[PDB]
Subunit: 125 residues, 3 copies
């Protein structure tokens, strides 16, 4: 029943340094068009981006494919449900891959301390 | 089937600072009566509290309840079995919630370094 | 169904300090023959060893640390498949224990930042 498992850890100060070197580049690689617009106006953009990077990198690793099946970051996004829990929403080729794998349930968890954000994703049939 | 997933990370030095500001308040909030009695005489109270917080916060996220404070920290506790695996024991509304969700198994794992403790919890039917 | 869950976090500088004190001792203890051969010529050997330690401690916790004696980190070999995905290959008593437990699938995920490596392992029937 478990189709894949993924984890990530992000050092928030490293993302801050990346933004200072190359501006919006990291945000546009990692965020969807929708999420990019929220980062542009967020009050804690570095922490927002660090936590999203953690979730989306964990989700990409959970899907677990090489370049042949690229779950590009620009075809899925994270949102919070009514309880504040992170949830994944997929479209385009990202959603097509989930259908091909027979993904029936996705589990997402995220935590952050001052200096690090960590996330785990499990996809299941 | 996986019913929920939760993870947490705790910066031990942040817990140390919390204790310096407000004494036993954090311990009284996170620990059950039984766990409080061990903390009172523990040789590493800060680390004991940091690791229990990580496990119990991970566990609350795995239950992922919309019941306002449905998995209250004062209604469950952690112990180790003969294999060294951390285990959850629930009473009151916490146990009622577990029964309503149909929880048949609870998997808990915990790790700590000098500066951080982390934990992941999966509940399953 | 899930047979076990384990997580670990490794402070890389702690591994680096161990190596400065006792050289190859740690690597020779925890790594399998295959992993030892990579450690000897790796361009980032300390980071290699720290990440392997994270997987081996996570996998040990998943199987159950106090189960038996004669289990050892060098029997939890990690390798990369043709996609670069980390995978477990078991030898000796670890392989026997897996067969006794009815392990049908093993899921491994690993992530590293500059100061920490973390891993989670799930074994399943
Ligand atoms: Na921190
Ligand atoms: Na306190
Ligand atoms: Na204890
Ligand atoms: Na115990
Ligand atoms: Na348990
Ligand atoms: Na700390
Ligand atoms: Na540490
Ligand atoms: Na050594
Ligand atoms: Na780091």
């Amino acid at each position: 029943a478990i189709l894949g498992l993924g984890t990530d850890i992000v050092e928030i100060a490293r993302i801050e340094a990346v933004i200072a070197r190359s501006g919006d580049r990291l945000a546009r690689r990692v965020l969807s068009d929708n999420e990019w617009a929220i980062w542009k106006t967020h009050h804690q953009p570095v922490r927002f981006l660090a936590k999203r990077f953690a979730v989306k990198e964990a989700a990409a690793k959970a899907f677990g494919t090489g370049i042949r099946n690229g779950l590009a970051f620009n075809q899925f996004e994270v949102f919070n449900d009514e309880l504040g829990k992170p949830r994944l929403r997929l479209w385009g080729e990202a959603l097509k891959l989930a259908e091909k794998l027979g993904v029936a349930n996705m589990h997402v968890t995220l935590a952050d301390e001052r200096h690090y954000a960590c996330a785990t994703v499990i996809i299941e049939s």
